[PDB]
Amino acid sequence: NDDIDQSLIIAARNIVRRASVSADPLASLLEMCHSTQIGGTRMVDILRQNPTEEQAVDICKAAMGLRISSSFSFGGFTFKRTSGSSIKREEEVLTGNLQTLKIRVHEGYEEFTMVGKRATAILRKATRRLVQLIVSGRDEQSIAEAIIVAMVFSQEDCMIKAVRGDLNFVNRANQRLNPMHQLLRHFQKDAKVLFQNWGIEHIDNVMGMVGVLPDMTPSTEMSMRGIRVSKMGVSTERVVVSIDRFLRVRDQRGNVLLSPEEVSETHGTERLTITYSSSMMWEINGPESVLVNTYQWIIRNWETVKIQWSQNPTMLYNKMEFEPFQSLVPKAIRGQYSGFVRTLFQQMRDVLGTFDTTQIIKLLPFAAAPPKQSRMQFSSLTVNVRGSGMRILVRGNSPVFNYNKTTKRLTILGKDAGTLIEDPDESTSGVESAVLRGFLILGKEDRRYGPALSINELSNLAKGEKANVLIGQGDVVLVMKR
Ligand SMILES: O=C(O)[C@H]1[C@H]2CC[C@H](CC2)[C@@H]1Nc1nc(-c2c[nH]c3ncc(F)cc23)ncc1F
Numbered sequence: 001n002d003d004i005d006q007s008l009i010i011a012a013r014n015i016v017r018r019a020s021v022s023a024d025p026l027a028s029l030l031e032m033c034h035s036t037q038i039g040g041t042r043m044v045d046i047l048r049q050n051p052t053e054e055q056a057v058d059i060c061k062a063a064m065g066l067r068i069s070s071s072f073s074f075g076g077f078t079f080k081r082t083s084g085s086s087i088k089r090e091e092e093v094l095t096g097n098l099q100t101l102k103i104r105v106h107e108g109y110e111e112f113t114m115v116g117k118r119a120t121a122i123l124r125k126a127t128r129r130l131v132q133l134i135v136s137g138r139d140e141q142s143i144a145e146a147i148i149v150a151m152v153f154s155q156e157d158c159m160i161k162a163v164r165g166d167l168n169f170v171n172r173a174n175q176r177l178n179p180m181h182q183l184l185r186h187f188q189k190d191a192k193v194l195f196q197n198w199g200i201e202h203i204d205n206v207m208g209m210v211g212v213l214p215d216m217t218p219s220t221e222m223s224m225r226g227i228r229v230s231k232m233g234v235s236t237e238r239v240v241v242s243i244d245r246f247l248r249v250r251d252q253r254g255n256v257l258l259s260p261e262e263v264s265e266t267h268g269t270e271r272l273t274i275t276y277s278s279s280m281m282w283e284i285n286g287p288e289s290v291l292v293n294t295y296q297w298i299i300r301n302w303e304t305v306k307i308q309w310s311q312n313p314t315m316l317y318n319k320m321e322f323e324p325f326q327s328l329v330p331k332a333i334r335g336q337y338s339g340f341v342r343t344l345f346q347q348m349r350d351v352l353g354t355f356d357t358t359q360i361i362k363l364l365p366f367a368a369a370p371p372k373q374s375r376m377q378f379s380s381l382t383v384n385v386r387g388s389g390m391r392i393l394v395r396g397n398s399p400v401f402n403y404n405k406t407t408k409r410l411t412i413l414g415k416d417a418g419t420l421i422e423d424p425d426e427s428t429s430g431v432e433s434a435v436l437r438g439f440l441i442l443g444k445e446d447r448r449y450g451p452a453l454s455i456n457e458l459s460n461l462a463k464g465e466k467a468n469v470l471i472g473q474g475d476v477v478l479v480m481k482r
Contacts, residue, residue, distance in 0.1 A: 010274065014276075020246065068239070076117070077146065079113070086106040088253075107127040121133055134233055148188060148191050199224065200225060208232060280320070287383070290328060291385070298364060309360060317368055329366065330384060338372070353429065359434045362392060443478055
């Protein structure tokens with residue numbers, strides 16, 4: 001039952017990481033935790049009774065209104081205050097790149113332990129001043145990680161002055177990181193200016209403790225100011241917290257104890273099966289599994305989908321289940337697809353007797369994104385699966401979308417998305433109301449209305465005239481305007 005904690009952590013990290021790029025991360029996070037199982041058992045039942053303290057596991061607990069440890073995480077280190085106190089106060093600072101940052105400065109004298117995977121440390125600090133850091137670690141990278149984190153955490157001015165270049169770090173949701181994570185990211189990328197301008201001191205002789213120079217060389221004579229490396233150098237109060245929309249967890253006094261930027265990037269492999277049900281975890285098996293599941297999901301929920309489509313489309317379009325598919329749509333074009341498809345849907349609602357089940361299913365995931373309006377008459381819509389742009393044809397079949405009108409079996413890149421059931425609202429006349437934006441196809445080629453136009457000269461017609469248009473290769477049909 002150590003194997004549960006191990007697998008609960010793997011599952012919580014995945015879920016938080018997925019949640020934070022979603023539209024509503026707190027909503028997505030709870031949805032996925034109620035969705036998931038760890039070896040037969042509901043995740044949310046393991047979270048209510050398992051005492052494991054880890055960054056992602058605690059974000060989840062916070063989301064379920066549970067109580068978690070008051071320690072906080074910064075740069076992957078768990079800080080536990082061992083003595084002292086501090087007050088918050090807001091300050092503006094000028095970096096070494098003459099950028100202006102508004103920082104939440106802490107004033108007071110404080111002692112902390114910092115605990116990490118590959119190094120731990122004891123830290124003493126005061127207002128904008130590091131007083132002492134004793135760090136022990138597996139190798140020079142680990143020690144250095146700890147030292148960088150303590151240096152940014154001290155908030156000292158020479159750290160601020162050590163910035164080069166501008167700080168514009170964002171997360172995957174393109175949201176700016178708060179300034180302390182701005183500075184920490186900048187120095188995690190390269191720390192030599194920071195180490196060289198920090199300052200050097202002669203050191204006293206103490207058993208089991210050595211100095212460290214700006215190039216991570218050990219020294220029995222000198223050391224970076226206030227820093228020592230030790231050899232043997234090396235948690236139970238739980239409090240009520242608040243979790244806001246973007247999963248930043250706070251304590252009563254408004255300190256951010258945990259956020260998604262504090263989740264470890266390590267990706268281990270479970271020793272118990274983890275089973276995600278959420279649509280959010282479809283992408284686990286590649287964009288192909290996204291597409292199949294999207295269309296599969298629509299078939300299985302057809303009865304609720306068909307009536308929300310018919311009377312409350314706003315809530316249909318905004319559903320959580322359509323976010324994964326939306327990733328696969330080029331961000332440049334997705335809004336104009338959405339605006340194209342929503343109009344075609346509205347034509348099918350307004351012009352009655354022309355309900356097409358296969359067509360609604362095909363285009364429905366494209367209406368998720370915000371409707372930007374265009375006038376291009378898309379003949380196909382594109383989704384990128386592993387870097388290549390596959391196309392769904394607005395009219396007819398396709399490797400991506402292949403429906404079989406007799407067997408009624410829908411196929412998605414090969415795999416069987418299901419089978420459609422007989423629906424009386426299905427139109428029997430050949431009128432297609434959801435292929436051409438602003439136009440209605442009325443069946444086969446009829447020569448008495450003229451010879452075949454092409455699609456770019458449909459604009460030269462106005463207020464519902466009746467023309468034949470070359471829709472494909474050889475395929476000619478009769479199309480009227482609204
Ligand atoms: O801004 C916050 O509230 C966060 C972000 C910036 C550093 C910590 C981790 C992320 C900080 N969280 C917390 N800081 C502190 C905190 C105490 N003394 C400090 N001196 C400098 C500092 F910088 C933060 C602190 N206490 C509890 C926290 F929970």
